[PDB]
Amino acid sequence: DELNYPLGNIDDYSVNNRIGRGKYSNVFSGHIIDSGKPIVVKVLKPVRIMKINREIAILNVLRNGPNISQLLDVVKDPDSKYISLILNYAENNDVKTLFGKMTTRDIALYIYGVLRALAFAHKNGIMHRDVKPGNIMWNQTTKEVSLIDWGLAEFYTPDSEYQVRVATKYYKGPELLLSYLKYTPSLDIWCLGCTLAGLLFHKLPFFKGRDSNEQIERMCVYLGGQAMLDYAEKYDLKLSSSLKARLSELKGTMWAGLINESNRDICTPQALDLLTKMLTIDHNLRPTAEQAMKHPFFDEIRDS
Numbered sequence: 001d002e003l004n005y006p007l008g009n010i011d012d013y014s015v016n017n018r019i020g021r022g023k024y025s026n027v028f029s030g031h032i033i034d035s036g037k038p039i040v041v042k043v044l045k046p047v048r049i050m051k052i053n054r055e056i057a058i059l060n061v062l063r064n065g066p067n068i069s070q071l072l073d074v075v076k077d078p079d080s081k082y083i084s085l086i087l088n089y090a091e092n093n094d095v096k097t098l099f100g101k102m103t104t105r106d107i108a109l110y111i112y113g114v115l116r117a118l119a120f121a122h123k124n125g126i127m128h129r130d131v132k133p134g135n136i137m138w139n140q141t142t143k144e145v146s147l148i149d150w151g152l153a154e155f156y157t158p159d160s161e162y163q164v165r166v167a168t169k170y171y172k173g174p175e176l177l178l179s180y181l182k183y184t185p186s187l188d189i190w191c192l193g194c195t196l197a198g199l200l201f202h203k204l205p206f207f208k209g210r211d212s213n214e215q216i217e218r219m220c221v222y223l224g225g226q227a228m229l230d231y232a233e234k235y236d237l238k239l240s241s242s243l244k245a246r247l248s249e250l251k252g253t254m255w256a257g258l259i260n261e262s263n264r265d266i267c268t269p270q271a272l273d274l275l276t277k278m279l280t281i282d283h284n285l286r287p288t289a290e291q292a293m294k295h296p297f298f299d300e301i302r303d304s
């Protein structure tokens with residue numbers, strides 16, 4: 001029916017260039033006319049007003065949260081009826097181009113910055129459900145970090161059942177691949193862990209596999225077949241006989257043979273220990289965001 005927001009005036013904003021094309025939006029850089037302040041304009045097809053209202057609700061809850069995209073205004077085009085979200089502008093230096101240029105220091109700021117966003121969101125009852133490099137705006141010069149694209153985000157109620165067709169391929173946690181419906185905001189910690197692996201090992205996306213059976217197999221190449229079998233037993237999840245047989249052949253290599261001369265310097269012992277904790281198969285045994293932020297890997301950047 002209507003939007004749950006006091007709508008602004010489309011005339012207050014200018015559009016500069018396209019910077020994004022999502023499944024629900026076209027995204028532009030722009031400005032606020034009276035201020036000159038740079039902003040991002042996210043233009044949505046006026047389709048699924050409930051979903052827009054949910055995204056608006058979520059972003060309003062997260063206002064003034066650290067390193068979270070900030071909703072400055074919502075406007076409706078009076079002639080086309082399209083809706084635009086007006087967001088803060090964050091520079092997006094693509095981490096895939098910065099392999100061997102991002103230091104240990106940059107990676108700790110990057111991961112810690114996103115953890116701050118997740119702690120605030122989780123504390124306010126929201127899980128993002130699509131953490132990945134593509135939704136993390138990283139400024140290699142300023143070190144600014146922003147977690148964006150809350151369209152898949154959901155409000156979290158314990159022992160509630162949720163749709164497992166979330167996240168992006170190769171960031172889906174075992175709880176989504178195995179269809180555990182009562183998954184938790186710890187999904188966001190697995191996804192950030194997969195991001196950390198990609199940065200440490202110079203490979204984004206880090207995990208692979210053509211289908212979900214092969215994706216489970218490839219996780220266990222590192223993490224061990226037994227942990228996956230034990231997980232599937234503990235939560236009553238279904239694995240085909242063939243996959244169980246394959247999983248029992250995998251001792252789990254962890255992070256061995258992933259450290260060569262080009263990434264040796266960023267693969268510190270503290271980083272691996274955080275990665276191992278974050279990529280824990282049992283979604284109920286991963287660190288919370290708050291716990292991960294207390295890891296010694298963040299000791300040297302904690303000051304600021």
Ligand SMILES: Nc1ncnc2c1ncn2[C@@H]1O[C@H](COP(=O)(O)OP(=O)(O)NP(=O)(O)O)[C@@H](O)[C@H]1O
Nearest residue numbers: 020021022023024025027040069087090148149151
């Ligand atoms: N605040 C922002 N600052 C800079 N770029 C942004 C911002 N929000 C979105 N983008 C860019 O636009 C792209 C698509 O935006 P996104 O928010 O993912 O669109 P969507 O259609 O709502 N969701 P999805 O279909 O999952 O992409 C992003 O991946 C970025 O490249």
